[model samples]
Target: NPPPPETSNPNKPKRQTNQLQYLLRVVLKTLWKHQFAWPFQQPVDAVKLNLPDYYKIIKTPMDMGTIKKRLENNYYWNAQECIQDFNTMFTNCYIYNKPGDDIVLMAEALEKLFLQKINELPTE
Candidate 1:
């Protein structure tokens, strides 16, 4: 089978909940901003959105592991091992959401995950 077509405008929502790829891309962007980086590198031909200029997080990502469990203590994924759980539960083999499917679950999951991380940070 052929790969999915590229998204011309990622800022614009593709589906109501978006495809698994889009969902992950957005979710990762949020998490990445909060000092999280992908365990794997993004593919060169990844169908990514032209995120705003301010979206650049950092120069390099922190390697997967922990130091006295301090760095690893987060909302959903603490380690690279736990990342697979999110992908396995929420993602498809590839990115793409069929129309009219009940994909609201993805949105809810991302929302709760984002909120949990927000609550973890120091308010001040």
Candidate 2:
């Protein structure tokens, strides 16, 4: 007699989830080591920087440190959520700093690198 068919494994989907999370962690590490990413490594201190109006303009602040913590805590459901935070960080920099500002230039360069690395991730 033929054997009964096997049932789907519940852990298979979780394995894929872990793969994406691992890829995201690697990408985050790269960004953390980037020279241009220095300013964005942690949350900006408006008082220390003497940019009193920073908080008023950029209500939602994001940084690589926060993203890393979120990733560690499994706060992101998918790659898209992780990418969105990176975009938000860049957008905040653009909105707060002028086009000619060094920070703005750094943000642009770092953002480019981020996109390049993320795009290279396996879509499967």
lDDT of 1 at 29: 51
Total clashes in model 2, counting residue pairs 3 or more apart in sequence or in different chains: 0
Residue-level lDDT of model 2, residues 79-118, one tens digit each, is 7766888899999999888779998888888888888888
- Model 1 score (lDDT): 0.33
Give a tens-digit lDDT track for model 1, residues 25-118.
4444564444223322222122253423212321122122221121223222223333443443234312233445544344344546755644
Worst 10 residues of 2 by lDDT: 1-10
Clash counts for the predictions, in order: 0, 0
Residue pairs with backbone overlap in model 1: none
Off by over 4 Å in 2: 1-20
Per-candidate TM equals: 0.22, 0.80
